């Protein structure tokens, strides 16, 4: 009856089967702690060495997901209680895509309920393209085409984003306009940008929208040679933030083992903050339009 | 081990929670009989008075499905043995469906495993539309959205299943195509009128069985439906039965009671293998004349 959520912080390798064992273990641990909704990071299925490597691994993800859906069903039936999963993966191009000549993976966030049913597939909207030098995420990753609909989770109304989305505030604002009480930003940040902006961005989106903000992150040095030079290290620091900007819960920084970060959301205090500072009633829609 | 299947025959009312209690009772009886896969009819969740009644009742069905998935987990865990469930229901329009003006319900056949996982939602492909000047007028697709896919074969505990729904049975190409994709078993969850039921129900089942050399499961609503039970007369032919690849009726409903009943048969897969080897209808087709499906 308490709005308890959790983050499964980990350090995904390029071995999808290894990564799945960690996810199942974290879900089992979360069920023991009576977590109602468990949030995993971006690219939980795998991190890759390069876009060509990513394309090959993406073909293994459909089997990752199906085994994950069945693990969820088995674990909740064994535990006798439900848990919902939010998890970021790489989706391979469909057969429509193949025929259209699109090879591009899709950065997708799955919302999966306790019966292993996928309720949402949010595809990341914002990609990092720079054209001075030049680096184009969109050469290998297909941008999404929709603002996701709000999900009615066991702990409240969720608006779901992925990683780089966090830097574009109009997306978060729009999700509040559609009724979100909670936002998530499953992510993998570099050490540099992680240290500079990870916590600032989370808190900013929290107070901008007066929402709980879930910040599930990859943490540590990724083994992108575990499916058989290139190095990949994620800032981590997974955390849960309240509508006032307070950090409710953050990762133990003194171990790089996978860990569960838990917080109970005080929805009533959120109602009071939203009532006392009614930012959405105060917008200048005669100036900016209506979204 | 023994390829034991079951049909759950019932008479759905307009009261979803009442119908769910019947469904769970039959699941429990089927676990006690060591049924591996239990087939329910079309519209097991409810029968309605009209299309607007159906549109309102369909909004309750998601809760019906979630509570069924939970009862399956509970009953199998309590029984210590697994069972799979094939059940026809109505699905309300999706969020995007309404965002395009489609308020129509969907005739969907769910396959749900021993862990509550939904492995397939098949949306009925064939609808009864008719517009004869001076009657009969009937446009099922005014109130019901057709599906867009031939379903994939399901690998069940008792063999490869191709799932269809009711009016689908009248279109032999669908059954032939399902055999093409690997089906050993076809199912046609149905609610038939008394007139067409007596004329064609058994004939249609046996025909599709020998056309494709498959086991054919015929789960049916039976009786007069209480379509005012959530607060027009609807009577279903019933006669649920299970048919073998030779057209033999293996097992048939007792017609002397409208009470929910379980109909059971053990499928002789080895005999099917021999029939399909010894009359290889699918090697004998004239694909030079008909193409390939």
XYZ file of C-alpha atoms in Angstrom, chain A:
291
model
C 0.000 0.000 0.000
C 3.173 2.127 0.030
C 4.432 3.572 -3.278
C 7.816 1.825 -3.228
C 10.009 1.954 -6.335
C 13.477 0.652 -7.009
C 16.377 1.067 -9.393
C 18.454 -1.846 -10.582
C 21.920 -0.333 -11.070
C 24.352 -2.517 -13.005
C 27.220 -2.477 -15.500
C 26.033 -4.290 -18.619
C 28.580 -6.228 -20.676
C 28.405 -7.231 -24.328
C 27.129 -10.691 -23.186
C 23.317 -10.507 -23.215
C 22.904 -13.800 -21.331
C 25.183 -12.671 -18.474
C 23.290 -9.363 -18.260
C 19.943 -11.198 -18.067
C 21.117 -13.211 -15.045
C 21.914 -9.954 -13.248
C 18.518 -8.467 -14.126
C 16.652 -11.559 -12.865
C 18.674 -11.543 -9.649
C 17.859 -7.860 -9.095
C 14.151 -8.453 -9.762
C 14.145 -11.302 -7.255
C 15.805 -9.025 -4.693
C 13.306 -6.268 -5.475
C 10.326 -8.615 -4.921
C 11.765 -9.494 -1.494
C 11.844 -5.750 -0.663
C 8.215 -5.287 -1.815
C 9.235 -2.994 -4.699
C 6.187 -2.250 -6.859
C 8.052 -0.928 -9.953
C 11.718 -1.614 -10.743
C 13.665 0.659 -13.104
C 16.717 -0.503 -15.086
C 19.151 1.690 -17.105
C 19.587 2.425 -20.792
C 21.178 -0.459 -22.747
C 20.666 -2.984 -19.960
C 20.647 -5.751 -22.596
C 24.207 -4.858 -23.735
C 26.838 -2.222 -24.310
C 28.828 -2.578 -27.550
C 32.242 -1.719 -28.971
C 30.878 0.182 -31.989
C 27.797 0.524 -34.176
C 28.675 -2.541 -36.247
C 29.087 -4.548 -33.040
C 25.798 -3.070 -31.810
C 23.945 -4.243 -34.927
C 25.007 -7.863 -34.423
C 24.075 -7.927 -30.710
C 20.680 -6.284 -31.367
C 19.666 -9.451 -33.224
C 19.961 -11.332 -29.900
C 17.709 -8.901 -27.984
C 14.283 -10.342 -29.006
C 15.274 -13.570 -27.263
C 16.560 -11.529 -24.319
C 13.146 -9.857 -23.999
C 11.076 -13.043 -24.347
C 13.184 -14.822 -21.734
C 12.841 -11.716 -19.552
C 9.042 -11.720 -19.911
C 8.902 -15.378 -18.819
C 11.341 -14.824 -15.932
C 9.055 -12.019 -14.710
C 5.970 -14.278 -14.830
C 7.775 -17.130 -13.082
C 9.224 -14.894 -10.344
C 5.960 -13.123 -9.478
C 4.065 -16.428 -9.446
C 6.710 -17.923 -7.136
C 6.667 -14.802 -4.944
C 2.885 -14.565 -5.037
C 2.961 -10.787 -5.601
C 3.341 -8.482 -8.620
C 6.182 -6.252 -9.779
C 6.461 -4.104 -12.915
C 9.709 -3.625 -14.865
C 11.021 -0.613 -16.817
C 14.132 -1.547 -18.833
C 16.100 -0.037 -21.714
C 17.223 -2.300 -24.577
C 18.334 -2.152 -28.235
C 15.636 -3.268 -30.637
C 16.714 -4.690 -34.035
C 15.114 -3.251 -37.161
C 11.865 -4.962 -38.038
C 11.159 -6.644 -41.361
C 9.395 -3.502 -42.557
C 12.694 -1.739 -41.858
C 14.769 -4.328 -43.760
C 12.747 -3.850 -46.873
C 12.883 -0.066 -46.407
C 16.713 -0.310 -46.295
C 16.948 0.676 -42.587
C 19.605 -1.193 -40.639
C 19.312 1.106 -37.636
C 18.855 -0.185 -34.115
C 16.188 1.425 -31.945
C 16.958 2.717 -28.432
C 13.774 1.468 -26.735
C 12.417 1.549 -23.169
C 10.078 -1.335 -22.275
C 7.428 -1.164 -19.572
C 6.579 -4.775 -18.650
C 3.926 -5.785 -16.123
C 3.974 -8.687 -13.669
C 2.423 -10.994 -16.273
C 5.274 -10.304 -18.701
C 3.083 -8.152 -20.936
C 4.757 -5.194 -22.660
C 2.599 -2.128 -22.074
C 4.885 0.447 -23.682
C 7.778 0.645 -26.149
C 9.209 4.159 -25.945
C 11.820 4.820 -28.626
C 14.395 7.493 -27.746
C 13.543 10.851 -29.368
C 16.817 12.814 -29.071
C 20.112 11.625 -30.596
C 23.612 13.085 -30.459
C 24.574 14.361 -33.910
C 27.454 16.810 -34.326
C 28.664 18.032 -37.728
C 31.658 20.383 -37.355
C 34.371 17.114 -35.802
C 31.575 14.757 -36.963
C 29.843 12.023 -34.950
C 26.305 10.885 -35.843
C 24.321 8.658 -33.513
C 21.536 8.769 -36.139
C 23.722 6.931 -38.660
C 23.150 3.763 -36.626
C 20.203 4.562 -34.321
C 16.690 5.377 -35.508
C 15.091 8.300 -33.630
C 11.621 7.740 -32.221
C 8.537 9.430 -33.614
C 6.302 9.927 -30.574
C 6.007 11.473 -27.166
C 5.028 8.422 -25.075
C 1.628 8.175 -23.412
C 1.404 8.305 -19.617
C 1.476 4.879 -17.909
C -0.750 4.186 -14.891
C 1.701 2.231 -12.754
C 1.019 0.787 -9.301
C 2.794 3.857 -7.825
C 1.339 6.625 -10.023
C 1.452 8.233 -13.452
C 4.775 7.670 -15.239
C 6.270 9.572 -18.162
C 9.167 7.615 -19.651
C 12.301 9.053 -21.305
C 15.770 7.758 -22.190
C 19.182 9.300 -21.373
C 19.946 12.182 -23.775
C 16.214 13.104 -23.677
C 16.925 14.610 -20.240
C 18.678 17.648 -21.800
C 15.558 18.736 -23.735
C 13.165 20.221 -21.146
C 10.138 20.614 -23.473
C 9.800 16.799 -23.479
C 9.592 16.657 -19.661
C 7.248 19.661 -19.564
C 4.934 18.016 -22.094
C 4.821 14.807 -20.060
C 3.756 16.835 -17.011
C 1.072 18.465 -19.213
C -0.197 14.938 -19.966
C -0.431 14.121 -16.241
C 2.891 12.559 -15.188
C 3.624 12.361 -11.469
C 6.893 10.461 -12.034
C 9.515 10.728 -14.786
C 12.335 8.270 -15.458
C 15.616 8.791 -17.346
C 17.380 5.404 -17.734
C 20.891 6.343 -18.788
C 24.542 5.679 -19.447
C 26.690 8.829 -19.005
C 30.434 9.239 -19.490
C 32.439 10.102 -16.362
C 32.979 13.691 -17.572
C 29.441 14.606 -18.457
C 28.132 12.410 -15.634
C 30.103 14.306 -13.014
C 29.258 17.657 -14.583
C 25.520 17.380 -15.182
C 23.927 14.067 -14.066
C 22.574 15.225 -10.710
C 21.911 18.797 -11.829
C 19.774 17.605 -14.766
C 17.781 15.176 -12.617
C 17.011 17.771 -9.959
C 16.203 20.372 -12.632
C 13.643 18.163 -14.341
C 12.270 17.312 -10.891
C 11.546 20.859 -9.850
C 10.641 22.039 -13.397
C 7.758 19.536 -13.462
C 7.279 18.996 -9.698
C 7.687 15.267 -10.316
C 9.488 12.378 -8.783
C 12.441 11.671 -11.041
C 13.948 8.211 -11.345
C 17.558 8.159 -12.530
C 18.598 4.542 -13.267
C 22.183 4.479 -14.499
C 24.812 2.116 -15.771
C 27.821 2.292 -13.421
C 31.406 1.154 -13.892
C 33.763 -0.091 -16.575
C 31.853 -2.159 -19.137
C 33.223 -5.467 -20.449
C 32.438 -5.012 -24.149
C 34.689 -7.997 -24.932
C 32.593 -10.546 -23.011
C 30.783 -12.001 -26.052
C 34.010 -13.308 -27.590
C 41.258 -1.234 -27.224
C 37.762 0.294 -27.011
C 36.961 1.358 -23.449
C 33.580 2.275 -21.932
C 33.028 3.603 -18.398
C 29.719 4.927 -17.010
C 29.334 7.525 -14.235
C 26.514 5.668 -12.458
C 25.212 7.421 -9.315
C 21.642 6.104 -9.776
C 19.220 8.110 -7.692
C 15.595 8.990 -6.956
C 14.560 12.645 -6.614
C 11.400 14.206 -5.164
C 9.238 17.053 -6.603
C 11.157 19.536 -4.441
C 14.580 18.481 -5.762
C 15.533 16.423 -2.701
C 17.585 13.270 -3.276
C 15.478 10.519 -1.637
C 17.901 7.708 -2.324
C 21.180 7.349 -4.172
C 23.554 4.545 -5.072
C 26.116 3.321 -2.595
C 29.222 4.705 -4.288
C 31.633 2.365 -2.463
C 30.809 -0.796 -4.456
C 30.453 -1.525 -8.182
C 28.440 -4.695 -7.647
C 24.885 -4.537 -8.991
C 22.681 -2.989 -6.343
C 19.066 -2.105 -5.624
C 18.296 1.554 -4.828
C 14.913 1.912 -3.132
C 12.622 4.788 -2.115
C 9.014 5.196 -0.996
C 7.316 8.023 -2.889
C 5.318 10.449 -0.712
C 2.531 11.152 -3.224
C 0.636 13.265 -0.691
C 3.532 15.689 -0.246
C 3.620 15.885 -4.060
C -0.072 16.856 -4.127
C 0.672 19.655 -1.639
C 3.643 21.012 -3.624
C 1.612 20.973 -6.845
C -1.320 22.691 -5.109
C 0.828 25.309 -3.345
C 2.842 26.303 -6.458
C 0.464 25.657 -9.388
C 3.011 26.135 -12.170
C 0.786 24.542 -14.816
C -2.108 26.912 -14.078
C 0.362 29.829 -14.333
C 1.789 29.129 -17.815
C 1.361 31.871 -20.406
C -0.493 29.885 -23.065
C -1.375 33.167 -24.801
C 2.416 33.497 -25.265
C 3.691 29.963 -25.911
C 0.592 28.159 -27.202
C -0.598 24.889 -25.698
C 2.020 22.274 -26.340
